[PDB]
Structure formats: C-alpha cells, structure tokens
Design a protein around this ligand. Structure first.
Ligand SMILES: [Mg+2]
Ligand SMILES: [Mg+2]
Ligand SMILES: [Mg+2]
Ligand SMILES: [Mg+2]
Ligand SMILES: [Mg+2]
Ligand SMILES: [Mg+2]
Ligand SMILES: [Mg+2]
Ligand SMILES: [Mg+2]
Ligand SMILES: [Mg+2]
Ligand SMILES: [Mg+2]
Ligand SMILES: [Mg+2]
Ligand SMILES: [Mg+2]
Ligand SMILES: [Mg+2]
Ligand SMILES: [Mg+2]
Ligand SMILES: [Mg+2]
Ligand SMILES: [Mg+2]
Ligand SMILES: [Mg+2]
Ligand SMILES: [Mg+2]
Ligand SMILES: [Mg+2]
Lengths: 236, 111, 95, 98, 46, 243, 109
RNA sequence: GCUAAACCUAGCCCCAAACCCACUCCACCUUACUACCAGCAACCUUAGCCAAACCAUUUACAUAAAGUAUAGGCGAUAGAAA
RNA sequence: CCUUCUGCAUAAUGAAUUAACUAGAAAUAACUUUGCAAGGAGAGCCAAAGCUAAGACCCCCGAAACCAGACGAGCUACCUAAGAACAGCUAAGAGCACACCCGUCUAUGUAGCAAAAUAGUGGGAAGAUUUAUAGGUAGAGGCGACAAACCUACCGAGCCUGGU
RNA sequence: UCACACUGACAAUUAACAGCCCAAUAUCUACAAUCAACCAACAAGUCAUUAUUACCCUCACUGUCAACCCAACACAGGCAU
C-alpha cells in the first residue's frame, strides 16, 4: 500500500510543482470518491492565499504590482502572479486586473471608509457598507478560504461591534472578525458557468471519469426541499 | 585470497598485503585461433583483473600489459536417473596479452 | 471496574486444578457496576483553613473529586491514616 | 497556510519508555545486543561523530560557523538571474543612460 | 481470443511479489517459509 | 513416538536448563509462585458452601476468575485490576433470543500524582478503581509497595515499585542536601518491606529482562591464557623453591 | 521460471544483471557520471619473496622417517618460549594501536 | 515362445526407556546465497460443519464415585466435585 | 448378470480382460455352557436365585458449501510516474485508407494447428485510442462508460491448509 | 536408433553497447511542444543553478552463443522499439 502524497514542499516555491494525480485513491488503495481519474497532466503552482504577510524585516503596509495573468488548471478561476518588494507570490486574480496594475496591501483599520479599488485589500473595518468581496478568512491570520472560485463574490451586510457579517455567495450569513483581511471585487474568469463543454473529450481531459451504470432508484431525498436560510454561524 | 574475509579500508589505512595465496589459475589452448601474443587463463570466481595482473607480475614475472576477462556458463542440460539437472562449475576466462612482442606459442604435449 | 456475572455455571474442577472454560461460559451478564452507585465521602485531615469546609486540624468528609484535585495534590490535606492521626492528636493536645 | 504536510515530513519518533522517568536506576535496554529487539526498553544512544574526515561522506558546518560569514546580505548576480522588470532594472542598478 | 497464455514472464515482478524480503516483511511469508521448511522443500522462495 | 516430558513443562525445562538456571532464587521463586489475584469483574463467594436453593442440601462452590485481557495501554499505565472483558450477552437477557458478543472497556482518565520516595510528578492514565484503591491504601507509594505483582497487572507500576525498593535499600540522596531530617522522616515512614538491594534489583523484571541482566552481569572479556600460564609458572617456581 | 537454478548474474534483466554480480570483491567506488576510481590501497598486493637459493622442493623423498603428530597449541608454544620467563626469576595487553592485530582480522591470510 | 508374473533389502508403523539437532572455507534479510555508510515493526472471545429429521438455545476437541447431583425452545446433548 | 422395481437381453443403472487393494466395527437388554451360591465378583457393583464371563447384531464411494489463515492486478477492470505508436489522399473528439486495437457474417473443426484457430467480407486508426516498465485497489471483498460482467483456462462470487 | 535437433568430452561470448552513481549548509526553476520564425489556441504543459566547506586515490563488476519467449509439443495462437 505504497501511497506518498506529492504535497512535499516546505519552502514556498514559485515554479510549477509536479502534481501527481490520485484518481480517487487513498493511502490504502481503495476508491472512496467516484468520478476522478484519467486526465491530462498538470503542474500545481503554490498559491499564496494569505494576502497580508510582510516580508523579512518588514511590518508596515507595502504596495504591489501585476506582471501577468495566467490560467490555473487546478481550479476554475485564473491566477495572476504579483511581485511585492524583494519577492514574488502567486495569488488569485480579480476581475478587470490587467498587467501592470497597482495593488495596495494594508492592515490599518482607518477611522472612516477607504475607497478600495478592484484589486487591493483592506480589513473589513475600513470597507464601505455593501461591497462585493472575496477570499474571506475564517480567523485573524488564518488564510483565505471562503469565496475563491470564478465569479463568486460576497457582499458586505453590516458591522456589529468588532465583528462583521459577510453574505456568502450561497445566501448564507457568516460573522467574521473585523481585524481579518479580505480582498474586494469579484474573482476573474467571468462567464464560466456558461462555458459549454461540447463533448466528453474535454470532460475526460479535466479528469472526471463517467458516472456509474447502476440505475439508482430515486428515494425520498430526490424530491425538492424548499428549506429556509440557515442560522448565522459566527467564529467568536 | 579466495573465501577469506577482506579488511575494511577506511581512508588512512595501510596497503592491503596478501600473504599465502589461496586461489589458483591454469592456462589452456585457444580453440578459436587467437593472435600471436594473447594467453588464455581460467580465472576463478573470486578474482578480478588487476588482482590476476599483480599475481602474475609477482610470481611468474610475465610482462603483463592488457587483460580482458569474462564469465563462462557451464552447460546444465544433463539429467540423471532421478531427472535432476547437473549444473557444471562456472569458471571465469581471461585473455592476457604479453608486451615487448614476446610471442608465446602454445607447446604441444603428449607427442 | 464493571461487576459482571457468568452464565451456565461452572462444573467445578477439583481443588488444585484449573477449570477448562468454554464459549458457553464466555457469555457473561452485567449485574452491577462501580458507577451509578451512591458515592462515598472519604475522610481527609486538612492542614490549613480553606473556606468553611474544614478547620485546621479538624477532619471532615470532603468529596472525592475536590479531595483529589485541590486538597491532596496541593498538600492541603492528608489521608485518614492511623500514622498521622496520633501526631495530629498530640499536636491538638499540645495546643 | 503552513506548507509541509505531516505525512511528508519526518515521522515523529515514538514516545520514550516510561522506565527512564524513574530517578534513577539502570533501565535494562537492548544495548548489550547488536540488533533490534521488540521486548525490553529502548536506549538513548549518544550523537556519534566520525573521527577522520571522508571526502565521500563529509558533512559541512551550519551557516552560523564560517570563515567570512557577514551580516550584510549581499545580492549576487549570475547568468541564471532572470530579471523581472527588464532594462530599467539594469539601468537603475548600473546608473547609466540608455 | 487465445486465453491459453495467462503467464507473462518477468523477473522483476516475480522477485517483488514472491520475494524473500517481501515474505519476511510480514508474518505471512514467515509462516509460509516455516511451513515449506517443515515440509522439506528444496526451494523456499523465488 | 511420545514425548519424555509434557507440553506444559517445556517452560520449566528451559528455565532449569542453562542461562535461566544461573538466575537468582528469589526471582525464580516469585516467577514460579503464580498466585490467584483479587476478584474484580465478579463478586466472590463468602464461604465454600452456600446451600443451593430448590434442594435443601449443601454443595461446595468456587469462584472462577475472568480470563480478562491486558492491552499495551494497561501495561504502559497504572491500572488497578480491571481490563478488557471480551464476553457475550443475549438480546433481552434471555437465552431464547439471539447470542451476540461484547467487548467491555474500562474508564480511563489522566490525573497527576506525587511520590515522596522518588520526588517526581507523573502523568499516568489512572482509572476509578485505581484511585479508589490508592485512597484506601493512603498514599500512592504505600499502594504500590503493598500490591504484589500479579494483582498489579502492569509494567510501569512494577518498575516504579522496583525503583522505590532500590531507593529504600541504597538510601541514596533523594532530596539533595539541605534536607536531612525530611529525608530521614520519609525513609522511616516506610520502615516496612525494606527489601535488600541484591533482591530489589530483580523485582518486576520479565524473563527476557532477567536473561539480559544475567548476560550483562557475567559478561566481561575472556582472560588471556598467557596470564594463566604465567601464574602456573610462578606457582611451579614457588613449589620448587619450597622443596 | 525454475526454482532450483541458483540465482546468479544470468537471470535478471539489464538492471538486475548490472547491480548483481559474482563474489569477486570490489576494488574501489563509483562517483560522478559513471567514473569508477581505483584505490591502490584496496588493490591486493601479493608479497612474493625471492626463491633464489631455496633448497626445498614441493615433493618429499621416501627415505624420510615417520614421526607422530604433535598438535601445536598455546601450552607448547609457551613451554618452548620459556627461557626468558625463567631467566627473569614480551606481552601486549591492548593491541588497538597495532598494525597486525590478532583478534580483529585486519590482515589477509 | 514373444510380450509378460516369482523372488528381501531398503524402509516403515505400534510401544518401553531417555528430554533431541543446530560454526570445513565464505554469503544469508537489498533482487537470501550480494564485503564496504545517517531510522514505524507482536502482546485481540476462534469460527463453522454436524446433531436436535429444519434451526434461530445448545453441541466434547489409573479405576470407582457416575453417567449421580445439575444445565438444557428442561431435548437433542453436556457434565463434575466431596 | 446386479437392482431401483407388481416387472428387464429388453430399446432401464453399471461393465474389454488379468493383477492386487476395496466395502458391517461398539451399547442397554437377551442366547450361552463354564466357577460359586443367599451370596456373587481381585475394594467400588448386583441381589424375593443371582453374580462373574468367552462367543454373537450394527459398511464403502458419491454433492451443492461456509468458517480463520496465507496468493493473487505478470491475462482481465480501475488508478499512479516516466516513454513509444499512428504512411498517404481530400480538408472539426472531419472522411477514406498503411502499420496497429476490436471481431457483425460466410465455410472448415469441435480430441481441431488452437481447452476459442484459419481466408475474405468488417468498425476505429490525431484520440474518451493502442502499447513497453514498475507500483497500488482481493472474497463478510476489489473493480465496473452496469456485462450483477471480470479478479491466472469452470466466479450469482477462486484457489490450498484444518474443521471434510 | 519420414529418415540420419539423442548421449559422454571439447570452448566460444572478452566492452568501448546499458547499467553498477553523484557529500553536505541554505537560495534561485512564470513567458510550452507542435521545422517555432507569422497566425492560431486549450487538454495550461516532458529536460536548467548559486557562495562556501572537503576532495587532484582513476578504467574494476554484470550479458555479450544459438534455430531462443509465453500456450502440455518442433503448435496456422500473442509480442514493443
Ligand atoms: Mg450525471
Ligand atoms: Mg443511469
Ligand atoms: Mg476427584
Ligand atoms: Mg441438523
Ligand atoms: Mg453381486
Ligand atoms: Mg417403472
Ligand atoms: Mg439388443
Ligand atoms: Mg440393457
Ligand atoms: Mg439408477
Ligand atoms: Mg435411471
Ligand atoms: Mg455403456
Ligand atoms: Mg454465503
Ligand atoms: Mg495492471
Ligand atoms: Mg476521426
Ligand atoms: Mg474511419
Ligand atoms: Mg441491467
Ligand atoms: Mg466430501
Ligand atoms: Mg547477439
Ligand atoms: Mg494450449
């Protein structure tokens, strides 16, 4: 049962790391998820989800600059490498983010609102009410996890004390701390859901095996469940 | 020596001396028309090329200059009344080439 | 522990002999358990006046949880043994 | 996000035997024997250091011990150094007109 | 088609599957070798 | 053919054979003892006779112990006398229903302890029965010293007992200087037991551990024959000079 | 796929044949891009003495006398080399820094 | 009369007694039969066929006491001790 | 000839011959002549003529099959890493067509060359294709573009060990 | 002794063909292949180092045959570059 995960790279490297496909196999060898395997070879690029993170002997804010906008095969949304200071770091690309643009990365919660561009990022405590955001973190210094696909974008509802309720794209309310960082605008790669596959060739190239042939009899879970919105889940 | 544990030379060790030679060798007559200088030998299974060269140059004092050894497999297609195959002893063959144009011809025996 | 009872009885195997059990005897029955029982209050001689639960030198019946968490580890109480009991009685008499 | 993955990193060694926490007897370990043993306790060997220096198996010291280790990190440049901006960076580093 | 050729020759796969090391790596191969020795076979492993 | 000795005697045969024969006697006696432990997962019978119902007559009755099972976690920690009971139970406590197996499990915790002999805090996984036994036996050291070897069912506890016995015998400094009266009082508190150092070194050790200790004791190195020959020559010279 | 044939360097594929071999005792090591270096120290140097003036032959004559066998042991050697031991009225305790050590076979035959 | 049958010694089984073997040279845990270099390894109720015409309870792997007391959809069967 | 059978040379089971091997073995209770007798028996057991005890009744081969443990991806299904293959003609998981992957029909055979073959007629042949090397997924399961198909020639669920 | 590849002894094959492999401390590997130069994209991709420490002992080992493998065989069956 030899199964070593290719995810072996402590140092954040910029080169495309050789991605060894899995095909739905675990450490034992049995399939636990059907519909994975048989696709085109890819190379994963170490993405820097954590937007705010100063370099060596640094602390205060620091500007950035866009160089190029490339495509990522490991996800639906494209990426764009951005260089900041004496180092580089792959990050998610936003809509209308051409090469050479300037991206501001700060963390000081200003007294009033700050007119954020379509690429920069500021703490929720300095964002106007009702603004589309993405790559929201869970806890201070954790890392971006929510709203990271193509076209997804959550709008800011309101702020209560040192917290902020974020309306996720799934019409679900999430209370996140005000000191957390989060980008603004919507993710690049617009009109992705309308991308017609056309033929099973591309589906197999993407790495998705055909569904099973068993005629599963639709039980009770097949009916439409008009459920209401769930309660607001906080992280405080 | 053959079938004898060898020492473990680290780095600053002394020269490996070999006293009382164990392995042996024996030449034969070529059967495929060899040049007028090469001399065949039956190197055992526990001996290299430089080892044989040094052994010769030390005991027989033959001016050895070039050697080319190879492994020969003995025929195993021989069964007895029990239907048990007989594996022949596999021996290493050599082809030592003399220097200074000595030209060593195989003498005829049993006239 | 868990007090469990056996089934089918044992046919007795002499005096100095081991009884050869069987799978039929492996079937046990839960008759009782150390838990679900009215807990007991052990006796502990306190060495300091901590709250109104006891007095310096006097003995009381404190709960096992507290007696093992805050009294015994912190050295604020001693087990109800006959060794230190005589010393405590002598100290009280000397007072 | 911490890059490393616990499965890829070096596996954590097993917990030390509970016999060494007793001050202070001689824990009967398998040190007397020259092979792994399942029963008995596990000893704690010292850090072995080779006496002679073997070029084929030589370990270099760390960065904290060197003959000319300087504190001011100087940035070197070679043929492999692929610039980012382009000619403007070279002009700025050289201080020359184009 | 002709299914009579069910054996594909290969020394690497043979030594990796029925190898002495792979056998001793688990008590399965240990017991197999012990049984083969108790029986008296000349060849224990491949 | 048949065997000269039974199958359940090869252990004693190997013990009396060679290396195991050179072992001390105080350890072999304790190993061969093998007494019954105290009941745990079953209530013992009062007297040997209880007079069963139905028929007004007496009949001898005994208390058979449970086979129990000691996993490595029990040997690693200090467990009283409980363990893993791999039994079976019926559906609704009736033999007319279905038969199914069951693997009872004990309750484990993680409390701290303090030993006055060794003076060191340990974080062992203690249970409820062990804590109750400790409370009944006053201190933890007294409980460890009063418990034999079979009723303890664990290696760490036996090692702790051996260490305590060695400390009591050697009388070595356990609290460093500046505390002589306290050390003397702690030593006098456990005046009982007091096993010699020669015997305390083989308490709680297993068979393999005892074999290793015996092999390491009389290990040494072979004496060169040159010294023996020189001694013989000196003796011969002395004998010749005396005559 | 026979089970009786002795596994040698004439069975496995290219890789196995290249890695395996006969018990010829290697000389040096291998480093760099396939660059085998020969160490003169590990090379077996045969110390051959001079045979000039050797009045011995590999065959003994039949006119020699017959004598009993006397297994030479440590006691016999000590008895033979007993002159200084008696004259006193030559031994190494540790041979760690010795060239031709006894117990650890550092020499060859 | 051609093909074909006749030969006891090798050896084995049942018992008594007694507790048996394991370094001529070298390799033997990696691709055993390989001289030569930086890692975690074991402590787990046996089950089931069968019988009870099926089976879900249950079913075994010195002498006498005695197949007695007992258990057993109180039955096939199990089963001692003083 | 044997016998299932009211009933077989029947056109019902079986059989070319000889060789050796191969198929009735125990209890409680009875028959029994011996030895003794209100006692019998080499303790213990029986007793309103019994006890002791030798002899004497009660076979073989043939299934479907699970349980615990080893062997299985070297043929077959899927996955993983690095390679190879696809002429030519008209111009996009385009068309014909080499090599190659698959096998709708014809005719030979079913002890055949072959426990799945031979010649033509066929679909694909720049892609969801074929393939050289190694590793991983194994039965109370794995895999499955589902044939409830395949897992070393017989898989509605394999083989071998003991319970057979 | 279809017919005479069946027995005992005789020795080739010589490596330069491919393997037998790189001592470490830390740091650089984003601008595909498709004559790659125009166009043209999607399945987003197959080849590269830095300063230092220490090292200048060097050509050993494995197969080099044949009418050959896997299917009970001297089998109209399968085998890549
Ligand atoms: Mg679907
Ligand atoms: Mg469907
Ligand atoms: Mg009895
Ligand atoms: Mg039945
Ligand atoms: Mg008849
Ligand atoms: Mg009829
Ligand atoms: Mg007729
Ligand atoms: Mg008929
Ligand atoms: Mg019939
Ligand atoms: Mg019929
Ligand atoms: Mg017929
Ligand atoms: Mg079934
Ligand atoms: Mg495969
Ligand atoms: Mg096409
Ligand atoms: Mg076509
Ligand atoms: Mg269907
Ligand atoms: Mg049968
Ligand atoms: Mg050739
Ligand atoms: Mg065939």
């Amino acid at each position: 049962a030899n199964f070593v995960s290719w995810k072996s790279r402590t140092k954040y490297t910029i080169t495309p790391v050789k991605m060894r496909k899995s095909g739905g196999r675990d450490h034992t060898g049995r399939i636990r998820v059907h519909g994975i395997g048989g696709g085109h070879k890819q190379r994963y690029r170490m993405i820097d989800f954590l937007r705010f993170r100063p370099e060596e002997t640094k602390s205060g804010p620091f500007e950035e600059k866009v160089i190029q906008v490339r495509y990522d095969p490991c996800r639906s949304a494209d990426i764009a490498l951005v260089a900041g200071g004496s180092r580089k770091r792959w990050i998610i690309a936003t809509e209308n983010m051409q090469a050479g643009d300037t991206i501001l990365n700060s963390n000081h919660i200003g007294r009033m609102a700050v007119a954020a561009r379509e690429g920069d990022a500021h703490p929720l405590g300095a964002l106007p009410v009702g603004t589309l955001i993405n790559n929201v973190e869970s806890e201070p210094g954790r890392g971006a996890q929510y709203i990271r696909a193509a076209g997804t974008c959550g709008v800011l509802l309101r702020k209560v004390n040192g917290t902020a309720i974020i309306q996720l794209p799934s019409k679900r309310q999430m209370q996140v701390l005000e000191t957390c960082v989060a980008t603004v605008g919507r993710v690049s790669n617009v009109d992705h859901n309308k991308r017609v596959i056309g033929k099973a060739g591309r589906n197999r190239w993407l790495g998705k095996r055909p569904n099973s042939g068993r005629w599963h009899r639709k039980g009770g879970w097949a009916g439409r469940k008009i459920r209401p919105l769930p309660p607001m889940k906080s992280y405080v | 020596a053959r079938n004898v544990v060898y020492p473990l030379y680290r780095l600053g060790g002394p020269q490996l001396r070999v006293f009382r030679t164990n392995f042996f060798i024996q030449l034969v007559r070529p059967g495929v028309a060899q040049p007028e200088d090469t001399v065949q030998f039956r190197i055992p299974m526990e001996m290299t090329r430089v080892d044989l060269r040094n052994y010769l140059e030390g005991i027989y004092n033959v001016p050895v200059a070039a050697v080319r050894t190879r492994v020969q497999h003995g025929s195993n297609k021989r069964r007895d009344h029990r239907n048990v195959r007989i594996k022949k002893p596999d021996y290493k063959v050599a082809y030592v080439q003399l220097a200074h144009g000595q030209t060593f011809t195989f003498p005829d025996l049993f006239p | 522990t868990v007090i469990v009872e056996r089934w089918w009885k044992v046919p007795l195997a002499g005096e100095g002999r081991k009884p050869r059990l069987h799978r039929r005897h492996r079937v046990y029955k839960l008759v009782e358990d150390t838990k679900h029982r009215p807990k007991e209050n052990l006796e502990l001689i306190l060495t300091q006046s901590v709250e109104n639960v006891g007095v310096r030198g006097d003995l009381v019946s404190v709960k096992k949880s507290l007696g093992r968490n805050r009294l015994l580890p912190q050295g604020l109480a001693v087990y109800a043994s006959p060794e230190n009991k005589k010393l405590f009685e002598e100290e009280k008499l000397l007072r | 996000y911490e890059w490393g993955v616990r499965s890829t990193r070096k596996s954590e060694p097993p917990p030390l035997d509970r016999v060494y926490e007793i001050p202070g007897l001689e824990p009967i370990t398998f040190a007397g024997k020259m092979h792994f043993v399942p029963w008995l306790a596990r000893p704690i060997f010292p850090p072995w250091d080779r006496g002679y220096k073997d070029p084929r198996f030589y370990r270099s010291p760390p960065l904290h011990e060197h003959p000319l280790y300087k504190d001011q990190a100087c940035y070197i440049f070679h043929h492999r150094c692929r610039l980012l901006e382009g000619v403007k960076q070279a002009l700025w580093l050289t201080k020359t007109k184009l | 088609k002709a299914r009579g050729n069910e054996y594909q020759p290969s020394n690497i796969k043979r030594k990796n599957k029925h190898g002495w090391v792979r056998r001793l790596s688990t008590p399965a191969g240990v017991q197999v070798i012990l049984r083969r020795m108790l029986k008296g076979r000349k060849s224990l492993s491949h | 053919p048949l065997h000269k000795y039974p199958v359940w005697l090869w252990k004693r045969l190997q013990l009396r054979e060679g290396i195991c024969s050179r072992l001390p006697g105080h350890y072999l006696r304790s190993l061969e003892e093998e007494r019954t432990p105290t009941p745990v997962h079953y209530r013992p019978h009062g007297a040997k006779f209880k007079i069963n119902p139905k028929n007004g007559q007496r009949e001898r009755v005994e208390d058979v112990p449970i086979p129990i099972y000691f996993p490595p976690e029990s040997q690693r920690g200090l467990w009283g006398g409980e363990g893993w009971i791999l039994g079976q139970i019926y559906a609704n406590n009736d033999k007319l229903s279905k038969r199914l197996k069951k693997v009872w499990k004990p309750q484990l915790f993680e409390r701290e302890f303090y030993s006055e002999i060794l003076d060191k805090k340990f974080t062992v996984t203690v249970t409820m029965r062990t804590l109750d036994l400790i409370d009944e036996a006053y201190g933890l050291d007294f409980y460890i010293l009063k418990t034999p070897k079979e009723d303890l069912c664990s290696k760490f506890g036996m090692d702790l007992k051996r260490g305590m016995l060695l400390r009591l015998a050697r009388q070595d400094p356990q609290l460093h200087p500046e505390d002589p009266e306290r050390r003397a009082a702690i030593y006098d508190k456990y005046k009982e037991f007091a096993i010699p150092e020669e015997e305390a070194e083989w308490v709680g050790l297993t068979l393999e551990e005892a074999i290793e200790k015996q092999r390491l004791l009389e290990e040494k190195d072979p004496v060169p024959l040159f010294k023996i020959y020189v001694a013989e020559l000196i003796q011969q010279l002395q004998q010749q000079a005396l005559s | 796929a026979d089970r009786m044939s002795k596994w040698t360097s004439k069975r496995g594929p290219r890789s196995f044949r290249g890695r395996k071999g006969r018990g010829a005792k290697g000389i040096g090591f291998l480093t760099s891009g396939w660059r085998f270096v020969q160490i003169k120290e590990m090379v077996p140097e045969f110390v051959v003495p001079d045979l000039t003036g050797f009045k011995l032959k590999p065959y003994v004559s039949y006119l020699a006398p017959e004598s009993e066998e006397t297994p030479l042991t440590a006691a016999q050697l000590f008895s033979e080399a007993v002159a200084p031991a008696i004259e006193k009225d030559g031994f190494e305790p540790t041979q760690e820094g010795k060239l031709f050590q006894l117990y650890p076979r550092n020499f060859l035959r």
